[PDB]
Structure 1
Amino acid sequence: TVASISSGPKHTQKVPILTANETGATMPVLPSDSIETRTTYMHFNGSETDVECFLGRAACVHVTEIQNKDATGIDNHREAKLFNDWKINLSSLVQLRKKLELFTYVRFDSEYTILATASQPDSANYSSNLVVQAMYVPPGAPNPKEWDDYTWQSASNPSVFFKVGDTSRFSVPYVGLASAYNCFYDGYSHDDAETQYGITVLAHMGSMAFRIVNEHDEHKTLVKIRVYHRAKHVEAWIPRAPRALPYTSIGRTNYPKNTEPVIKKRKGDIKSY
């Protein structure tokens, strides 16, 4: 492939460099339209800018935490982090978010990796070996109430059991209801006067719930869960302007008030170098 062809002096009536940008086109002008060039080859394919590659590496999408401790006398397991859940979503952590929102609709399979590490902040004789049981709880399924409810039987709901310190990995097909996931949605769930506006209405994909299977030892053990997400088989439509201001909320476009100028001011003139 040639990156530049050889081109010499020109004295024409045919001027490729004068255009009318009002038309909305970006005319494909090249170095050889306005200087004299020599042949050179590309030596490159643009492999690593493919959208599959761009969205295809694992990104941290969520960090939560649960603890193993005596539940005796706990009136609210959920509240003691005896188990915890996560209202699945991919917009909470914002590094991966800016990348996805370069597109309007996106379609992909997900590969999740879940790393779990334990901490024992206060005096323990040892490190126990805990098994985590993260289970997927889709919309309209008995949400779990204690850390050892019938829910955890999970007879119809996919669940994975792995050890703290290890990693769990599995992959979920594209579960969207439509043909693509909306990265943006300028609508409502119905024409009410006070119903929420955004995608949050849209992208209610149910939540994920984690717990330790082990009963309690004499000390307490903090287990912190990190969920990583990798898109595989990516398809993206309609590019948009990149995010400039900071994010404030999952699912709304809102930016913070009295934010700071995002364009760097010159130290000098327009004329400055």
Structure 2
Amino acid sequence: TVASISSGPKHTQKVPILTANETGATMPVLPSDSIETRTTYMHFNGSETDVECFLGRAACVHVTEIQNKDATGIDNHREAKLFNDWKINLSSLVQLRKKLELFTYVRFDSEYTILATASQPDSANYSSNLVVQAMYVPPGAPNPKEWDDYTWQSASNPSVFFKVGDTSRFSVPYVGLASAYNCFYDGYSHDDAETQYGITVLNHMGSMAFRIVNEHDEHKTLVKIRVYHRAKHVEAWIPRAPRALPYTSIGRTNYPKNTEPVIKKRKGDIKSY
């Protein structure tokens, strides 16, 4: 594959470097159209810039926390974090979000990796071997109310049990209701004067609960859970302007009031180097 062909002097009626950008087209002008060039080859395929590679690595998409402690006397297990849940979405942590939002529609399979790390902030005689249970609770499935509900039987909901300090791995097929995931949605759930706007009403993927199977020890243990996402078998459509201003909310395109200028200001002239 050639990168540049050999091109010498020129004196034509054919002016390639003269176009009209108001047509909306980016004419494919090459160096060899405005200067004398030598032959050179690519030696490059562009494999690393294929969308399958761009979204093909694990990125953290959520961090949450649960703890192993005496549940005796706790009225709201959820609030106490005896078990906690994550209302699934990929727009909570911005790094991956900006990437995905480089396109309008996106379709792919996902490979998740859940990392759980332990912590004993105050006096403990040892570090316990806790086993975590991560259960996917689809929309319509009964949500857990107590850390040891009947819901954790997970007869039909899928779920994994892994040691804290260890990692959990599994993959999920493209579960979109449409033919692709919407990164943006200029619409509502119905023609109503007050309902929510945005992909907020579209990406309703349920949530996944986390808990620690073991009963409590004398000391309290703090388990922090991190979910990582890796896309595979990627397909993307309609590229769009990259995000410039910082995010403020999951799903909305909203940006903070009184935000700092994102375009750098010149320390001088427009003639400055």
Give the Cα–Cα distance (whole angstroms) in 1 for the partners of residues 50 and 176 of structure 2: 23
Deviation at 1:224, TM superposition (A): 0.2
Secondary structure in 1 aligned to 2:228? Answer: strand
| TM-score, scaled to structure 2 | 0.99
1:186-236 per-position Cα deviation (integer Å, ceiling 9, x unaligned): 000000000000011011100010000000110000000000000011100
Distance 1:140 1:163 in 2: 28
For residues 35 and 60 of structure 1, the distance between their equivalents in structure 2, rounded to whole angstroms, comes to: 47
Distance in 2 separating the partners of 1:124 and 1:217: 9
Listed one character per residue, the Cα deviations across residues 79-121 of structure 1 (whole Å, up to 9, x for unaligned) are: 1000000000000000000000000000011100001010001
The TM-score, its normalising length taken from structure 1, stands at 0.99
Cα distance in 1, alignment partners of residues 156 and 131 from structure 2: 21
Q: Unpaired segments of 5 or more residues in structure 1? A: none
CA distance in structure 1 between the partners assigned to 2:127 and 2:42 by the alignment: 56
**Matched residues in 2 for 1:12 and 1:118: separation?**
73
**What is the CA–CA distance in structure 1 between the aligned matches of 2:89 and 2:18, rounded to whole Å?**
48
* Cα offset, 1:48, TM superposition: 0.1
Q: CA shift at 1:74, angstroms? A: 0.4
CA shift, 1:165, in A, is: 0.4
For 2:135 and 2:24, locate their aligned partners in 1 and report how far apart those are by CA, in whole Å.
50
Tell me, what secondary structure is at the counterpart of 1:78? helix
CA distance in 2, matches of 1:42, 1:109: 32
Over the aligned positions, Cα root-mean-square deviation in angstroms equals 0.4
Runs (4+) off by over 2 Å: none
The CA deviation at 1:72 is 0.3
Listed one character per residue, the Cα deviations across residues 127-182 of structure 1 (whole Å, up to 9, x for unaligned) are: 00000000000000111100000000000110100000000000011111000010
Q: Which residue of 1 aligns with 2:172?
A: 172
1:22 match: secondary structure? helix
Matched, 1:104 2:104: yes
Give distance in 2, aligned partners of 1:7 and 1:238.
Answer: 36
Deviation at 1:12, TM superposition (A): 0.6
User: How far does the alpha carbon of each residue in 1:4-44 deviate from its partner, in whole angstroms, 9 at most, with x for none?
Assistant: 00111001111101111110010000000111000010110
Superposition deviation, residue 54 in structure 1 = 0.2
1:84 maps to 84
Q: Check if 1:147 corresponds to 2:141.
A: no
In 1, the alpha carbon distance for the partners of 2:188 and 2:23 equals 34
- For 2:159 and 2:255, the matched residues in 1 are separated by 37
Following superposition, the deviation at residue 60 of structure 1 comes to 0.3
Cα deviation, residue 75, structure 1: 0.3
CA drift of 1:240 comes to 0.1
User: Matched residues, percent identical?
Assistant: 100
SS at match of 1:238: strand
Any residues of structure 2 matched to 1:65-214 within 5 Å, and which? 65-214=65-214
How many residue pairs align between the two structures?
273
Structure 1: distance between partners of 2:170 and 2:205: 18
Gaps of 5+ in 2: none
Q: Distance in 2 between the 1:86 and 1:97 partners?
A: 17
Deviations 1:36-65 (A, max 9, x none): 000010110000000000000000000101
